[PDB]
DNA sequence: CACTCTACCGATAAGCAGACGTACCTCTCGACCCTGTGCT
RNA sequence: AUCGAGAGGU
DNA sequence: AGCACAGGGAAATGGTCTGCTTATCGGTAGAGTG
């Protein structure tokens, strides 16, 4: 299993002003994902 | 002896909570490239850092 | 196999009481003896 | 036969490696086949122009 | 560039195959890389450090002594974590705010 | 969003920390996919140090929109950030 | 919502209170503490550290 | 046209309940019931 | 796998 | 006629903080009386 990045790490990440650092750890690490939206309502629409 | 473990183990929840607290209520103020601090609604906090 | 089975679950889960009131019944009256060390062992079978 | 002359937009997105002198000619072919200042999209690198 | 997936231990001639541009190749972290460190829990900045790698025997991660002190740490048993950045812009932001000497 | 003028600007003229950080990353990552290099490489195999040997020389073709908090923009170039 | 005030509890056939949708978002493990503030991250290392 | 008995919307607090709680990590150990009803 | 309990580490 | 075993089953009683809901209660305001 993974390590827990968790609040206060990202605060750190916070501060020192790293804002792709936050981007790869939280989601390019993590649990990235894709969704296609509705630009008329807003929802998940359905995607083939 | 008993009583300084005691206080370290209340102490460390104590201050964890009040770190929390502190920063999820400073997180959105940044500097601004007019040089104000503002937060995330563009209130000024400060119209320079640290006056 | 009502009293076998009461105190083997309690005995076994620590759960004191009826299976049928977990959540206000006990818990911890029962644990794994330590088997670490001769010492470990005396130490978890005095402990209050 | 009602032809109607209109303005349109598109965004073109355009890969590192075209990012030359040549980079205008590209895109104006890419926009017949399928300019402003190309965004550079963070963590891709590519370049957004509108 | 298809986005499949070549894995060097189970393809038979891994060694074999010519690199094209465009592609990737996931090597090992080696001696000079940037890597975030930290300890919990994370009280400051100064708990998140970018350090530059040396890989060497043995089990445990070894760091200068006069860097425990922003960590809050000793070797008494304590346990530390290790990120790798995994792209350029990431390295540059470790690199360039994050290092210990910046620190 | 209303793009300033080059000379009614008011930001800060030099690089920030964080502007330094950005640039060198996103240059960096452009050159590790192929982007041409605009400076001599004496060898460099590093996308990273590539990016900082062009920064040296400011031949890294990349502007900074820095935005004001009213939404007003002024775009500062590479070269031009001290 | 299964923590409503003054109503009794959808049980588990275990003898549990449900995992209602509240349950889920709510918490320090729930969603947006557990999931979205925090995360565990790939490509990360840990172990014992000597000088 | 001096009075004093009830109508008022106000404010007062009142007791009420309901709502909150350091970080990260390692491991072990235990996990429904009751009764209809066909089978043989 | 999930859930709960417990023992520990800094 | 007593138990498998899937169908049919929920029951004897054993910290300070905010916002809502109630009693309390003046300060006038009608006038009801004079």
Redesign the pocket.
Known sequence: ????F???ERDCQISHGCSSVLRERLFDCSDAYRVIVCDICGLIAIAS | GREGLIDT?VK??????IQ?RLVKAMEDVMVRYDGTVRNAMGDIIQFAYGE | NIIT?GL??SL????WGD????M?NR??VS??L?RYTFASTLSHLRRT | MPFFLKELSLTISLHPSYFGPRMQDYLKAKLLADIDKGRVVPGQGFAEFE | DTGERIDLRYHKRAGDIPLRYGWRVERHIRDGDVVIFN???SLHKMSMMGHRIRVMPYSTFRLNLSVTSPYN??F????MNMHVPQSEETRAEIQEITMVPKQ | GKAVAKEDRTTTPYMTKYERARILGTRALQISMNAPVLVDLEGETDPLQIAMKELAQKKIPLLVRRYLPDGSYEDWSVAELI | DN?I??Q?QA?Q??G?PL?SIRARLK??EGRLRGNLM?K?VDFSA?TVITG
């Open positions: 299993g993974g390590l827990r968790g609040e206060m | 183990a460390t929840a104590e201050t964890g909570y929390r | 089975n083997r679950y076994a889960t620590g759960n299976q049928k009131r977990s206000v818990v911890g644990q794994v330590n | 300890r919990q829990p740490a000793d008494d048993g304590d346990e | 923590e005030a003054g009794p049980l056939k275990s549990r995992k918490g320090k925090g565990r840990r």
